Amino acid sequence: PTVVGRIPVLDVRPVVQRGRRPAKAVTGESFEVSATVFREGHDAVGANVVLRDPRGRPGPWTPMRELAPGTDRWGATVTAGETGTWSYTVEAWGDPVTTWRHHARIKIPAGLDTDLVLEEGARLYERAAADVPGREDRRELLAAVDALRDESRPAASRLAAALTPQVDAVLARHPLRDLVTSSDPLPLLVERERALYGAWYEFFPRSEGTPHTPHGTFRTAARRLPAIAAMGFDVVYLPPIHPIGTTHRKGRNNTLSATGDDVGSPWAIGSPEGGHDSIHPALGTLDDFDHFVTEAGKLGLEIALDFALQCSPDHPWVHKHPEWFHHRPDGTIAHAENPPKKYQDIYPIAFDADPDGLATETVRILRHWMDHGVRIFRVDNPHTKPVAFWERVIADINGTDPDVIFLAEAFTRPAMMATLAQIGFQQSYTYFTWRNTKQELTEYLTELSGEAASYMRPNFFANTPDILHAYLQHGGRPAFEVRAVLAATLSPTWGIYSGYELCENTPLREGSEEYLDSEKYQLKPRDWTRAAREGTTIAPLVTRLNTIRRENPALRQLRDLHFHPTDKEEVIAYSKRQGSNTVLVVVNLDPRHTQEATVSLDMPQLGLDWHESVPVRDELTGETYHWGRANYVRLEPGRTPAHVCTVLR
Amino acid sequence: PTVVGRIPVLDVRPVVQRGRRPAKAVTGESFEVSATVFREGHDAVGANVVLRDPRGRPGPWTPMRELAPGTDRWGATVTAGETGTWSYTVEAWGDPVTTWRHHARIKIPAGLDTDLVLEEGARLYERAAADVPGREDRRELLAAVDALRDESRPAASRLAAALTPQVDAVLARHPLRDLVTSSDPLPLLVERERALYGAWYEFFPRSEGTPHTPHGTFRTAARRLPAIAAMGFDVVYLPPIHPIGTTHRKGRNNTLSATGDDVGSPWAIGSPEGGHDSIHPALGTLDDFDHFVTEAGKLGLEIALDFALQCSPDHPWVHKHPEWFHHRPDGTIAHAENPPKKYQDIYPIAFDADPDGLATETVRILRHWMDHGVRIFRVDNPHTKPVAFWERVIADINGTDPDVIFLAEAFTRPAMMATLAQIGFQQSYTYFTWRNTKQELTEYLTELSGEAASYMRPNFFANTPDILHAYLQHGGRPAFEVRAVLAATLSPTWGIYSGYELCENTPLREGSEEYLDSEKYQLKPRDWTRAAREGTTIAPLVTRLNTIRRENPALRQLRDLHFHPTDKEEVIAYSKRQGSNTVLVVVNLDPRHTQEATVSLDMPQLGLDWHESVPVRDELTGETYHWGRANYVRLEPGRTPAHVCTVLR
Ligand SMILES: O=P(O)(O)CCN1[C@H](CO)[C@@H](O)[C@H](O[C@H]2O[C@H](CO)[C@@H](O)[C@H](O)[C@H]2O)[C@H]1CO
Ligand SMILES: O=P(O)(O)CCN1[C@H](CO)[C@@H](O)[C@H](O[C@H]2O[C@H](CO)[C@@H](O)[C@H](O)[C@H]2O)[C@H]1CO
């Protein structure tokens, strides 16, 4: 038993954990399958990819090509179909016809061995016709065989009868493959479109109240849903909707002692009113929640609930399951931390006394909300809980409900972030907010669109309730406009947290990424009507970006992305492609000064020739341009963040 | 059945073809085992490598360390023992003591819960003391436990009693390990020292003849062995010693027609007088071979026979086994080609008709020469035969005789060269002869000493009967001295083909790498006695280089190699280390012009601080120096090709 087959097929990619975890795709997504393929001697080889659906049914004939000269690295693009677990193999084989052609095109014109050479080609084409299924094809090959053996015609006439485009066609479909060798199957997990592509919007229902009842309900907060859908979003992400503890409840601006009417942080879950399977009483009943979900569904909006595996000191688990927490010698439970951040209002979970009870209760809670229409969960801080626990929980839920999507809020070191996606997490938060220079964005997006794309799907939130980057603080509305362009065009999934449209950017203090008067600790009513009428919102820009994404398949994928050089450090340029759709973006990363630059596009990367010129339409303005290998641009902050151009037919 | 453990331990290296082939070492060789190790939350982790011998007995406690901050990549050096098939795993675990220490050193000076902190540390140390085997260790830890619980003492004094170097030593030897998680075992093949370390000498026995009998015999050739051993070599590699064909026998200088007394090419194996198991009648009998082997053994020389799986047209296989060759429609057998090279005097073997008979016959021939003391085989052009054939043959032979070394003579593309080593070849010819500038040499040996060392051991032949590089053609004797210094100091295995020490460098023609009047097609008698008498040889430099290697364990390994920068393109500097032995080498790559430069050593990479001077001795002259962060060198072609220095005490 040899590790290597007759014709070596090695190091098939993509591969996750040496084959023990699946590579990932979504319905209709294209990606490259590659392998190292070669043979002994100098004769030619060929290779093809066999992608099998969940029932074992192979896909179309998919031949591979050597990706670079002298590397023996071969590749071919496949497209994922319906959801489920697929498999793919690589088949390699001797290519006797190419070998005989290449050498017959030398020996016949120079009179060497012609009768012996032409008869050798007749014997090959004969073996080729034996493995050809259709009879019209089978006679096209036997006609070339007979013409090859016709000693009464010139040798150049006999040879050329086997090198015609009509013999090219049969062989480019049913080629003669020698010593066919196969790799071992590699698994592929195909999931639904929303796992890769979608626009996300986060807001606090309790903030959308009334003058008489300032604490909003699910029934008042449902009034925001039409505006959210009108901005082109597909997913509404809600902070925890459960009762909030009173013991050590935090006050406004993250103060230790709440006073009077303070509402506390929604992530300090649990009170005598209920736990993770309960509704905050100021938000209404489980019946109102169904109404909210139903109204969201009518507008094309899916709900994503926050899942925070933690407890306030008043959560029922504290006395019903004391072994789910670590107790110090005096019996107290230390509050959760994530340094240098401290959460004096919550307890972390201990997983090693009763791991089965925790997993059983966790999937029960998730299935409760799944029964009420929640098919997406934003998982709070997964990296402070055991990695294997999430692997077990995700596999349990997806085993019965493969449509459920899990998003990992893991802002941590690279190894943990990769592993969490590799063990099941459909989506991952990223380093996006901390990549603001051209070098940072080019390097990070090269990483996310490269090998990481076989297991990680990025969700680019331009802001979060805990992340107001110094770029937005110092750049004002122009900064908000640039980050929206970048996030919406660089990832097929992007999102914002309410208030971003209004360019809220007052930090807690200098050096902090917290908002002043953070919504996490207080109701935040907003004059949405006045901002629209006074034009002080970038919702129109947000709306246009989502329209452009809904209209251009290139912005609904991740792996096809290429950066084009500019002569200005503040100006970045890149393109993305999907079939015949090509989008080109040029962004001025300077929010305070106008920048002009030449954009030297990589034309073969666009499928064009260096001399060619193409018409483009700036989808932000409707203006038409004609662009070639060198293009002048002038971008003024406030007036224009970027050009978002589509290539016209 | 989760893939990931309690404490994630991931991507264990070295790994070869995802664990389907073993990583390699030789007895006494050290290498690094690495893994990605981390845990949820912020508590500390530890890790260690468990190395098991062919019986399953684990090696010593081998703790790992994080190789670079923030990477979660851990490693530790291991050392292979006896030959056989080993295994290795990485164990990861929570390290609570480190976690508690880092917290207590902050909280006790701050007066924050010090009674609770020291009591948490007492219970931890109690858990540690139960595990330790000795009584002197258990009394030690329990003494620190009681000092922690002594409330009559100050808080800092109670804590300090747990951080004393005595308690540091107990747990550095027997650490408390929580939630021990293990990787799956990976295979490691350990082989004898000769597989990695050895100096080789190739020569044709027939050229060592007499005036009355010009064609040498095994008996006359044996008289050449003393000078070979005196030069410090360990292996003699003989071209094929079998009968040579007559049909299409090449003439002198590779002419297509041999005339009269032309001896022909030894690689054209086969005549009616016998095949691969026979001996050329002009060489003698099997008994004379045995005498040749015995005289080799007496001088400390192993025999390496060339194995060329190919035939002359007069080889008995041509008619006894016709299906071992590819026949054309007319029944003729096309001669072998490695284009644009033609060998009209041999037939290539076909493997697809009777692969079993070929494998059976190949191992039979190999075991016959093994019965006569041949434990090393130089395999001729393995890359024109199927990869799986060599995997099968090497597995069969090494199954009964693991001491047998196979050397792949595969000057081809990188993927086949790497695959051949991974499927079983103990040694590999390399691109050495085509790596002559400082950039070429630095880049190539970074590759060989890096990850490839896990599966490939390089044999640095400075010349072969087919390779006389233009650097030697144009550089004369100084160029021969440069390449011998490089080959001997840069790889633990290196070799020369006879005539190299006489600086034979006359090409067949300009731009060729063939020798003029090549020894492959004619007797090439050499006046060794006159060469030594007249000093027209570099045998002493070869002898001194080989002795330096025998007196310095650093030059007997591959993985440890660092390059140090200089001021001139033509002057290269590098160092190699093994235990206390550190060798420093400075080479003038210019064989025509004297070069002066400053060698700016990376003193940390040497185990010394930046502001320090340390004694060196050039082992080519005996002169001694004192070298530091900067050192002026002056190298003169013909008198000082290079400095070869050991570090003195
Ligand atoms: O801060 P991160 O690094 O991102 C931690 C991630 N989790 C959420 C992420 O969005 C945060 O919403 C949440 O932290 C909020 O909730 C806590 C509980 O009451 C408060 O103690 C904190 O003051 C407040 O900031 C935190 C823990 O659940
Ligand atoms: O030339 P390479 O490209 O490196 C092929 C390498 N193999 C040996 C290398 O060590 C060579 O000794 C050997 O080629 C010699 O023997 C032939 C007998 O058929 C002659 O025809 C050639 O003229 C002569 O050069 C060749 C095949 O066995």
Side-chain angles (χ1 to χ4, degrees):
Chain A
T2 39
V3 287
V4 85
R6 181 66 190 85
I7 304 288
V9 185
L10 315 164
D11 194 29
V12 180
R13 288 184 206 209
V15 58
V16 183
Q17 316 250 62
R18 301 174 190 167
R20 306 204 111 248
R21 286 290 308 163
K24 298 182 191 188
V26 295
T27 288
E29 186 188 2
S30 287
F31 66 94
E32 181 171 76
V33 170
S34 54
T36 290
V37 174
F38 59 94
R39 77 164 298 166
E40 86 283 358
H42 332 94
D43 300 354
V45 293
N48 53 283
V49 184
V50 178
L51 175 72
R52 290 183 184 281
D53 74 2
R55 284 233 70 71
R57 293 133 86 239
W61 167 252
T62 315
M64 299 166 88
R65 85 208 165 271
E66 177 167 51
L67 295 176
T71 67
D72 306 294
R73 193 71 189 173
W74 292 58
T77 303
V78 304
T79 300
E82 48 158 349
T83 60
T85 289
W86 295 50
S87 81
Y88 51 95
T89 53
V90 171
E91 283 170 357
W93 33 276
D95 187 353
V97 174
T98 302
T99 307
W100 177 84
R101 282 176 163 221
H102 165 264
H103 274 166
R105 297 176 72 244
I106 304 308
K107 293 175 173 151
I108 306 296
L112 302 315
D113 276 343
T114 61
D115 268 350
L116 213 49
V117 159
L118 297 172
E119 166 63 24
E120 272 162 339
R123 267 160 221 210
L124 276 180
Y125 283 55
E126 275 185 322
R127 296 210 278 104
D131 299 317
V132 164
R135 185 142 227 153
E136 169 273 314
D137 288 336
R138 206 159 52 229
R139 303 177 177 319
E140 192 74 43
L141 270 168
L142 291 164
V145 162
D146 294 335
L148 269 174
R149 292 209 172 111
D150 188 355
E151 314 154 8
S152 79
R153 277 160 71 234
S157 302
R158 309 161 63 177
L159 162 64
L163 310 185
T164 62
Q166 308 81 55
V167 169
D168 278 13
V170 174
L171 292 172
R173 177 52 183 106
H174 302 95
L176 186 57
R177 313 190 304 163
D178 280 349
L179 313 169
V180 175
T181 307
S182 191
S183 68
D184 288 331
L186 282 171
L188 168 76
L189 173 61
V190 180
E191 313 189 85
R192 61 183 175 114
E193 180 192 55
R194 186 63 77 236
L196 178 70
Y197 160 77
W200 284 54
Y201 188 85
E202 163 175 29
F203 83 108
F204 289 69
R206 72 184 182 182
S207 269
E208 302 296 322
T210 67
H212 295 160
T213 309
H215 192 298
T217 68
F218 281 117
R219 277 194 135 69
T220 63
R223 86 204 168 194
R224 276 301 290 176
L225 296 174
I228 296 164
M231 278 186 291
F233 289 99
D234 317 287
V235 172
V236 172
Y237 154 45
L238 308 181
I241 59 172
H242 319 295
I244 293 169
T246 51
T247 311
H248 293 122
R249 171 183 289 199
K250 278 179 162 167
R252 314 173 61 254
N253 277 294
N254 199 31
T255 45
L256 250 53
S257 306
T259 66
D261 278 331
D262 286 336
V263 280
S265 164
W267 287 266
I269 299 164
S271 92
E273 299 144 319
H276 290 66
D277 53 12
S278 287
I279 309 283
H280 192 307
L283 292 180
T285 65
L286 183 52
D287 177 65
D288 306 317
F289 182 77
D290 295 343
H291 170 89
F292 187 95
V293 171
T294 303
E295 281 315 318
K298 289 181 192 160
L299 294 165
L301 289 170
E302 295 162 73
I303 302 299
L305 284 199
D306 193 304
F307 180 61
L309 187 48
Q310 66 195 28
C311 295
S312 89
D314 314 303
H315 192 296
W317 288 354
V318 178
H319 66 78
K320 281 179 183 301
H321 304 281
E323 70 276 1
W324 291 357
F325 313 81
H326 174 77
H327 310 249
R328 309 175 82 183
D330 65 358
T332 66
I333 306 165
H335 60 66
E337 294 184 12
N338 213 340
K341 293 176 174 170
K342 314 194 162 353
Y343 318 128
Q344 288 86 339
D345 51 338
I346 76 189
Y347 291 161
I349 294 284
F351 289 84
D352 294 305
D354 185 24
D356 293 345
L358 282 168
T360 296
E361 172 69 3
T362 293
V363 304
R364 184 195 63 91
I365 287 167
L366 299 165
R367 284 189 172 94
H368 170 57
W369 298 114
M370 288 160 43
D371 286 340
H372 290 255
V374 176
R375 324 298 298 180
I376 307 175
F377 291 99
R378 184 267 201 188
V379 177
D380 189 90
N381 267 353
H383 59 292
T384 62
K385 296 70 141 185
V387 175
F389 177 87
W390 297 119
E391 174 164 6
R392 184 188 161 169
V393 165
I394 292 179
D396 188 285
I397 290 295
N398 280 145
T400 57
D401 304 80
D403 63 301
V404 176
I405 291 172
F406 291 90
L407 164 59
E409 189 246 326
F411 302 112
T412 186
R413 302 197 299 277
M416 171 68 89
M417 287 174 89
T419 300
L420 283 172
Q422 294 180 356
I423 54 96
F425 269 99
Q426 278 81 26
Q427 278 181 34
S428 309
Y429 280 82
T430 67
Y431 295 146
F432 179 71
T433 55
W434 299 286
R435 302 301 190 259
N436 299 281
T437 70
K438 175 163 66 173
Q439 183 184 12
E440 288 164 5
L441 287 154
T442 307
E443 272 165 17
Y444 193 49
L445 262 300
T446 308
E447 177 193 346
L448 289 182
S449 59
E451 303 224 296
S454 67
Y455 56 84
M456 177 184 289
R457 299 184 194 104
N459 185 326
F460 279 180
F461 262 88
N463 72 324
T464 73
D466 314 283
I467 304 164
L468 166 72
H469 198 275
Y471 182 84
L472 301 166
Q473 299 177 31
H474 299 155
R477 173 164 178 163
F480 281 84
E481 291 173 3
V482 161
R483 298 303 292 174
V485 169
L486 297 160
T489 48
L490 289 165
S491 168
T493 291
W494 83 294
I496 60 174
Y497 147 56
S498 63
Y500 187 97
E501 316 99 304
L502 316 177
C503 311
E504 297 166 358
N505 71 334
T506 301
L508 187 63
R509 71 178 67 88
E510 187 62 27
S512 160
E513 287 177 358
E514 293 281 312
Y515 291 83
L516 182 58
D517 299 340
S518 158
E519 203 171 356
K520 289 178 305 185
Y521 322 112
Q522 75 183 65
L523 307 190
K524 257 221 188 310
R526 282 173 183 110
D527 207 333
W528 302 106
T529 293
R530 182 179 140 180
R533 147 182 85 237
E534 294 188 6
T536 45
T537 169
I538 60 163
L541 168 58
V542 171
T543 308
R544 187 59 191 165
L545 286 170
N546 285 326
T547 307
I548 296 164
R549 295 157 45 87
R550 294 179 166 190
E551 276 169 7
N552 291 279
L555 301 188
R556 311 209 283 283
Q557 55 88 44
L558 165 70
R559 300 178 213 230
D560 200 300
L561 170 66
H562 187 273
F563 293 91
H564 302 273
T566 89
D567 73 288
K568 273 287 181 42
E569 205 185 36
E570 293 86 355
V571 172
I572 184 171
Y574 52 87
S575 74
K576 309 174 60 173
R577 298 176 51 195
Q578 173 63 26
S580 80
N581 184 259
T582 295
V583 175
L584 267 86
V585 191
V586 179
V587 186
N588 174 12
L589 306 186
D590 190 329
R592 323 209 72 136
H593 303 125
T594 306
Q595 301 277 348
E596 51 176 276
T598 304
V599 178
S600 323
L601 308 173
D602 196 337
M603 306 288 304
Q605 202 73 21
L606 301 162
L608 312 170
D609 223 307
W610 288 103
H611 66 96
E612 203 181 330
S613 186
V614 278
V616 302
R617 185 209 317 166
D618 192 347
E619 301 294 340
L620 287 193
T621 64
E623 285 298 309
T624 37
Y625 304 110
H626 294 89
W627 276 4
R629 55 162 302 161
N631 316 279
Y632 177 87
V633 292
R634 182 176 188 275
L635 294 173
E636 178 187 356
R639 171 189 306 277
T640 166
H643 297 304
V644 185
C645 302
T646 59
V647 167
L648 308 173
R649 73 150 213 151
Chain B
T2 284
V3 171
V4 182
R6 180 61 188 85
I7 300 302
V9 48
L10 296 160
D11 308 329
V12 180
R13 279 184 258 264
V15 66
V16 175
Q17 274 174 230
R18 308 185 183 153
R20 314 222 31 211
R21 291 282 318 160
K24 300 192 202 180
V26 296
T27 295
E29 191 196 3
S30 276
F31 66 98
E32 202 182 66
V33 173
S34 59
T36 294
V37 170
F38 64 89
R39 75 165 299 166
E40 87 279 1
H42 316 277
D43 289 8
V45 293
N48 63 279
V49 182
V50 174
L51 178 60
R52 291 178 183 284
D53 65 33
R55 283 131 184 91
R57 307 174 292 200
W61 173 246
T62 305
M64 302 170 89
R65 62 180 198 291
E66 197 177 10
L67 303 179
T71 68
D72 305 303
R73 190 78 195 165
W74 293 62
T77 306
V78 295
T79 294
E82 57 165 319
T83 70
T85 293
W86 295 49
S87 83
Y88 53 93
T89 64
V90 169
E91 294 176 325
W93 36 269
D95 180 13
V97 168
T98 295
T99 310
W100 173 86
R101 280 184 180 200
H102 171 260
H103 292 1
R105 303 172 112 280
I106 305 301
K107 280 170 187 304
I108 299 279
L112 181 74
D113 275 333
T114 49
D115 264 352
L116 207 49
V117 162
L118 301 153
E119 171 61 19
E120 269 159 333
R123 304 189 182 198
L124 201 64
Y125 277 50
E126 263 169 340
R127 272 170 50 209
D131 283 345
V132 282
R135 55 182 59 62
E136 73 282 3
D137 300 329
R138 198 166 80 239
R139 184 253 331 161
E140 180 67 27
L141 292 185
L142 287 190
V145 174
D146 294 329
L148 277 159
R149 297 212 163 109
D150 185 5
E151 299 167 18
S152 79
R153 287 296 168 77
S157 151
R158 299 165 63 176
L159 159 66
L163 321 172
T164 63
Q166 298 86 294
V167 188
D168 283 310
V170 168
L171 311 154
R173 154 199 334 144
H174 299 320
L176 178 68
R177 310 191 304 157
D178 283 345
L179 315 158
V180 183
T181 308
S182 205
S183 64
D184 285 325
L186 284 167
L188 166 64
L189 170 75
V190 178
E191 310 181 279
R192 63 196 177 93
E193 163 175 69
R194 191 59 67 214
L196 180 73
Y197 166 70
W200 291 49
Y201 193 86
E202 177 191 7
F203 84 102
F204 293 69
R206 67 193 187 176
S207 281
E208 303 301 320
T210 66
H212 291 77
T213 306
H215 191 300
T217 61
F218 277 127
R219 305 214 151 257
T220 68
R223 310 204 166 93
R224 179 61 183 157
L225 301 172
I228 294 167
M231 269 183 301
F233 287 100
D234 318 286
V235 184
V236 283
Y237 152 45
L238 305 181
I241 57 166
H242 314 108
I244 298 170
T246 61
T247 305
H248 298 121
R249 174 182 293 202
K250 298 281 198 63
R252 294 160 331 232
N253 268 296
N254 200 22
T255 47
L256 261 60
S257 289
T259 66
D261 301 288
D262 276 346
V263 292
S265 164
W267 285 267
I269 298 158
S271 86
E273 299 163 313
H276 290 76
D277 52 21
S278 318
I279 287 181
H280 197 309
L283 292 180
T285 64
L286 204 52
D287 284 39
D288 300 315
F289 180 74
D290 294 331
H291 171 84
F292 182 85
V293 173
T294 296
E295 290 303 314
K298 284 170 31 71
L299 289 154
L301 292 168
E302 297 175 75
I303 303 290
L305 289 196
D306 195 294
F307 178 63
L309 187 39
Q310 56 192 30
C311 295
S312 83
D314 314 314
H315 195 293
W317 292 353
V318 177
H319 293 317
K320 188 193 181 143
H321 297 301
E323 64 282 4
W324 295 2
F325 315 84
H326 186 285
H327 305 255
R328 322 189 59 179
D330 62 349
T332 60
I333 300 165
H335 63 76
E337 299 183 2
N338 241 22
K341 280 174 185 163
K342 307 197 164 332
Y343 328 118
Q344 299 86 319
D345 56 328
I346 59 174
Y347 292 161
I349 294 289
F351 292 81
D352 299 319
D354 179 32
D356 290 330
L358 278 167
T360 305
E361 184 63 10
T362 288
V363 305
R364 185 208 134 226
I365 300 155
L366 289 170
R367 289 185 166 105
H368 169 74
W369 299 113
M370 279 153 58
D371 292 341
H372 294 261
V374 175
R375 315 308 284 182
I376 312 176
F377 288 105
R378 187 276 202 177
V379 182
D380 188 88
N381 290 84
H383 62 296
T384 59
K385 333 292 171 317
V387 178
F389 176 82
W390 296 123
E391 174 174 5
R392 176 176 172 177
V393 167
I394 287 169
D396 189 293
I397 288 293
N398 275 149
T400 60
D401 297 74
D403 72 299
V404 174
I405 297 172
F406 289 89
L407 165 53
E409 193 253 337
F411 300 108
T412 177
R413 299 200 299 274
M416 167 78 74
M417 284 173 82
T419 307
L420 290 173
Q422 295 172 4
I423 59 95
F425 272 97
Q426 284 79 11
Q427 277 194 23
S428 290
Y429 282 82
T430 73
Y431 300 146
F432 178 66
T433 57
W434 307 282
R435 295 305 183 274
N436 291 282
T437 71
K438 170 158 74 187
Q439 186 178 351
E440 292 171 332
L441 283 157
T442 310
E443 280 177 28
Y444 188 54
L445 287 117
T446 296
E447 190 188 344
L448 281 173
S449 52
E451 275 202 334
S454 355
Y455 57 80
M456 172 179 296
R457 304 177 195 106
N459 191 328
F460 272 13
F461 261 91
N463 73 322
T464 70
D466 321 273
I467 304 170
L468 166 73
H469 194 266
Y471 180 86
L472 299 179
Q473 304 186 28
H474 301 164
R477 180 175 170 143
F480 279 74
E481 299 169 342
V482 166
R483 293 310 283 187
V485 171
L486 292 163
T489 55
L490 280 171
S491 163
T493 297
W494 80 295
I496 59 168
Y497 148 62
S498 49
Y500 182 90
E501 61 274 57
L502 318 179
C503 299
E504 293 175 3
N505 69 336
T506 309
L508 178 74
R509 75 186 48 96
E510 158 68 14
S512 171
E513 296 189 330
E514 291 280 319
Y515 285 95
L516 173 58
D517 307 316
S518 158
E519 190 170 12
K520 289 176 292 179
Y521 328 98
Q522 78 180 57
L523 303 191
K524 208 137 189 68
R526 286 180 180 99
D527 196 350
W528 301 109
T529 294
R530 172 180 161 131
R533 171 170 73 253
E534 296 171 7
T536 48
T537 176
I538 64 168
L541 166 72
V542 164
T543 306
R544 182 62 181 159
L545 277 167
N546 271 332
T547 279
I548 289 166
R549 290 156 45 91
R550 301 184 155 174
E551 294 173 344
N552 281 277
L555 304 186
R556 311 205 278 279
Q557 53 87 37
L558 168 69
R559 301 164 205 253
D560 195 281
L561 170 55
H562 186 82
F563 287 79
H564 303 284
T566 86
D567 321 82
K568 309 273 190 42
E569 242 176 320
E570 302 305 328
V571 173
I572 193 164
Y574 47 94
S575 47
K576 288 180 61 155
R577 296 168 69 187
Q578 165 70 36
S580 44
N581 174 225
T582 299
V583 178
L584 268 67
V585 197
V586 176
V587 170
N588 185 5
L589 303 171
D590 200 334
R592 255 153 160 71
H593 301 67
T594 280
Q595 300 280 331
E596 323 167 60
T598 309
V599 163
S600 306
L601 301 170
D602 290 347
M603 310 287 316
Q605 190 50 55
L606 297 161
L608 328 170
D609 216 56
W610 281 103
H611 304 289
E612 178 183 353
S613 150
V614 78
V616 316
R617 175 177 47 167
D618 187 1
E619 300 292 334
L620 300 187
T621 65
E623 252 193 20
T624 67
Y625 309 89
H626 294 81
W627 274 350
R629 96 149 61 220
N631 319 277
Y632 158 91
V633 279
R634 192 186 177 259
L635 291 177
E636 186 170 2
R639 216 200 71 198
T640 51
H643 296 304
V644 178
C645 301
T646 63
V647 183
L648 323 163
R649 146 204 182 261

